[PDB]
Every structure is written in structure tokens, then in C-alpha cells.
Amino acid sequence: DIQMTQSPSSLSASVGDRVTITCKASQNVGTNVAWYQQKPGKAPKALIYSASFLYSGVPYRFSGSGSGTDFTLTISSLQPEDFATYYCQQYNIYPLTFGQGTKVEIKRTVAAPSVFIFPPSDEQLKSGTASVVCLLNNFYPREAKVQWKVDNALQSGNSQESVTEQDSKDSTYSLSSTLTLSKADYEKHKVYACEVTHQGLSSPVTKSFNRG
Amino acid sequence: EVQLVESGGGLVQPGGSLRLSCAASGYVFTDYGMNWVRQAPGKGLEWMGWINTYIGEPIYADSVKGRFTFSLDTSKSTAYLQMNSLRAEDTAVYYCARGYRSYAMDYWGQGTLVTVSSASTKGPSVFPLAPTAALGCLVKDYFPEPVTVSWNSGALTSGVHTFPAVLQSSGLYSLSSVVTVPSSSLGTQTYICNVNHKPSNTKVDKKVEP
Amino acid sequence: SDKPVAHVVANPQAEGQLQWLNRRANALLANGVELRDNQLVVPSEGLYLIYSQVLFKGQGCPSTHVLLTHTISRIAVSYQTKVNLLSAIKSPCQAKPWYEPIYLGGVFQLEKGDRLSAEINRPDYLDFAESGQVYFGIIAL
């Protein structure tokens, strides 16, 4: 069983930056080595084969190199859509083996989140539980803090979050927050509010509403 | 256009048995072999095996040897993955990918997620989030994954954000999909999110307005 | 004549890519040789002259060592194995543009239904601009 070890395990770089990831094989695989690009929750896209060869319709900025044991994948000019995980693979002998993956995240100019707050669908309250949603939209970098406040009462334990991967157009993030309580505690306290803090924003920002 | 389209996956119960089909189109199916690759949820790529489509002989990785088996219908250009005695550890996206013997993989099937779990399917619920203006759907309390969201059947992509599902205290997942529109577009044009959950019961669509 | 033959060419419009092309004057697909997925399909067992020439061109040299490689592969019908038959390497670099051609030629026995693949590693460096510079071909003997 041939090991493949990529370095780094992940990297940040600015758009336009030359980017190298390196693959080292636990045995000499010759040139039988291939690189793949997997954007998140997508199939892998084949990039390079027999260590330098380009697959058709793959952008030129991609160049594979190396032989023996050490191999390097190189993105000449990094692009917002090159955001992905890249896997080297050796096909020299069975079984085929893959590197562990290398996350490539894009660095970009600071962006402040668009904050939206969502009283739950009546159709939910009817069914007996309830959810308030805050949407942080198209921001950067990934750190944001979402405080759930109901009439100045800071909640906790009661709310979850999901965050997008980097949008391949602008290289930003988006956040969904969800505040769950049964209809029993729907009408509970005065305000339903969402307070957000991000280092693209002037001062800590709440956006809110009230029931009915 | 070469196409590998896969299916058969979804919820199973432990010790169970499943068959996966990789249906190939756009090339001569017996001009290339077929690789089977599984990927754990968020981990890296594991190579299960290769099968010669011309003479039908497979090759298995040592781990998977015999507990999985590959086969073919040449005449319909489909390759098969038979999965048996499945354990919770077997949960993964399973991929079929085209390639010669002991060579790289040019085309990959879209993958299909197998969930080995004791529990039973839960169809989604679906709820409107009603209003540059932004708006969305929310898909609560479904198991297992995946869930897909389009909008207007796919005629609205610009601005679509579909979040990864969180795991709730329920044990059940949930996710929301949103999108942003212009503030004049409110009331005029028609925005409906179309939610699928295939491994369970469902298709759904939802009207969304103030 | 009666022998399986091909002389095919790079496609002038094909966008920065190597796409073998027989629809052309002074180009050949005949006697059962098919062009399938940009590969030559051997219609019958026999001995085939196989040949290809690519002509690479740069404008100057970017700051990496460049290895241009040009390869003819035999994909065997039954085993479904891709194997090197003919390969050559060139290393162009160490204002004004440069030109490196690569020729490959040889005689091998091929099984019916075998495939031949003429390929290179860097299509950005490929010059088909005028004609006769990029071609792939075989004839049975």
C-alpha cells in the first residue's frame, strides 16, 4: 500500500497568487500520478494525469509536475473558483491510493454581512414548534457572532447555525441561524431580535421584529 | 457528453444489503473500465475496486473483498455495486468513476450517499421564510440526508444559498435555502423553492410571500 | 487501396486543444479505422506503422523548467490497459519565441479493436497555426 502525503493540508491565498501543493509518495510511482479537484459536495473533477498531462477543458493555470516520489500541483494564477480540495493519486500499482486532500481557501477584501430576520411560517406554529431565522449574507472573513436576543434576553443552548462554503464567484460566506422553541413558548417574551457582529461592520448590528 | 449517473443509495439498516447502479452514457461503455470509490462523510477518497467492462473481471481492495461485488449490464451500459452486511461505519458517498486498468479516473459519477442506520426515514417538513430583498425556504426534521433544493425548478440560481444541514437535538437534520432578489421584483415575479428528498418519501414546492 | 489507414490532423479551430481530425483535404480515415473519442480504432489484427508529430511553440520562457512530452498509447481492447508505445521529451527553456517539434514512429502488432492515442501534456504550448505541423497516423502492413 503506497502512501501519498500532500502538504500543506490546507492553505489560504489571495486571488492571482501562485499556489503550490506538494505530494510525496511512500514509494517511487514514476509518473503514474494524477491530480483531482473536488469542490464541496461535488464529484471530483480530473485535472492532470501521468503527473504532467493536462485533461481537456481544464484551465491552463493548472500545471502538474514531478516524478519519482515527490510531485507538485501548481495553480499559476489563483482564481475565486479554484476554491476546492485537491487530491493527488498514484496509479503505478494496485490498490490505487489518494492523498489526504488539500483545502484551498481564497483570501479577499473584507465584506460586511447582510442581516435578515425571519418570523416563523404560520404553518409551523400550527404544527406546534417554532423557528426564528437569521441570515448573514455574503461576507468575509468567516468569523461572525450571532446573538439571539428576545427583548434584551440573551438566549443560549437554543439555537444553531450553518455556514456556506466559499461562493465560487466572489469567495464569500453566508450564515443561517435557527432559533427553535415550541408554539408554547412562541408568544413568550416581548421582542424577537437578532444581533450580529463582524469586523466588516461599523458597530454591532441587530435586525429584528415583533409578532402578529 | 460522457455521463455517469448513479443511484440505488439512501437509507439502509445495519447488516443490510444494497445495490448501486452506475449508468453510463455518451461513450462506448466497453471501451473503458469502471472504478468504484467511496468517500466517508468529510474524509478523503478510498478506492474500492476496478472492473473490466469488456471481459467482466473485477479487482477488489482487500478490505472490501467479497463483502462488496461489482457486475455489469453491458447492453444497458450500467455497472453495479452490490453491498451487503452493511455497518454504520459503511456510511459514505459511493462513486463510480471511469478509467483504464490501474490508471487515473477521468469521469466521476455524481455520487450517491448511503446511510447505514438503525433509524427510519423522515420526510422533510417545509416552511416559507417570507421577506435588495431576500427570502427563502426551510426544510426541518428530515432523516437521512441528502436533500436538494432548486428554485423555480432551476430557473433561479443567481443568489441561491443552500446551507448544509445541521443535526438537531432531535437526531433529525434540517437546512434552509435562501436567495436574494430586487425590491421591485416583490409581488410581480413568481418564486417557489422546490424541495426533494429521494432516499425517503418526497417532492415539495412552496409559495413564498409577505 | 485496401489497407487500414489513417492520417488525421489537429483541428485549426479546436480551442487550444488537441483534437484529431480527418475531415480535411489530405487527411485519411479508411478501411475500418474509426476515430472514436479522439483515438484511432484498429479494425483488424496485423502490423501497423504508427506515427505522430506535434509542434510546440512558446513566446519566451516563463520561470519554470518546462517539460514538453508527446506520447502514443495503445489501449488494449481486452485488458483495457493504457500503455506507452512512443514517447519523447523536450525541454525548451534555460523577447523572442521558440519552436520545438516532436516526431514519433514505429511498428507494432495490434489486436483488432485496439486503440491508439496520440497525446501531449501541455496543449497551451501547441502550434497547429499553419498546416502539416500536427498529425497522427497509422497504416497496416
Residue numbers in the entry:
A (entry chain B): 1 to 212
B (entry chain A): 1 to 131, 140 to 218
C (entry chain F): 9 to 102, 111 to 157
Q: What do the study authors state?
A:
We determined and refined the crystal structure of human TNFα in complex with the certolizumab Fab fragment at a resolution of 2.89 Å with R/Rfree = 0.225/0.265. The structure showed that three Fab fragments bind symmetrically to a TNFα trimer. The interaction of a single Fab fragment of certolizumab with TNFα buried a total solvent-accessible area of 1887 Å2, which was larger than a typical protein–protein interface (1560–1700 Å2), and thereby contributed to the high affinity between TNFα and certolizumab. Although TNFα exists as a trimer, the epitope of certolizumab was composed of only residues from a single protomer of TNFα. The certolizumab epitope of TNFα consisted of a number of residues, including TNFαG24, TNFαD45, TNFαQ47, TNFαT77, TNFαI83, TNFαV85, TNFαS86, TNFαQ88, TNFαT89, TNFαK90, TNFαR131, TNFαE135, TNFαN137, TNFαR138, TNFαP139, and TNFαD140, and most were located in the DE loop and GH loop regions of TNFα. While all three CDRs from the heavy chain of certolizumab participated in the interaction with TNFα, only one CDR from the light chain, LCDR2, was involved in the TNFα interaction. Interestingly, the bidentate hydrogen bond mediated by TNFαQ88 induced a conformational change of the DE loop of TNFα. However, the structural change of the DE loop induced by certolizumab binding was incompatible with TNFR2 binding, as the positional change of TNFαY87 would cause steric collision with TNFR2. Thus, the neutralizing effect of certolizumab appears to be a consequence of the partial overlap of the epitope with the TNFα-TNFR interface and an antibody-induced conformational change of the DE loop. However, this region in the TNFα-certolizumab Fab complex is completely unobservable in the crystal structure, indicating that the EF loop is flexible and not involved in the interaction with certolizumab, as observed in the structure of the TNFα–TNFR2 complex.
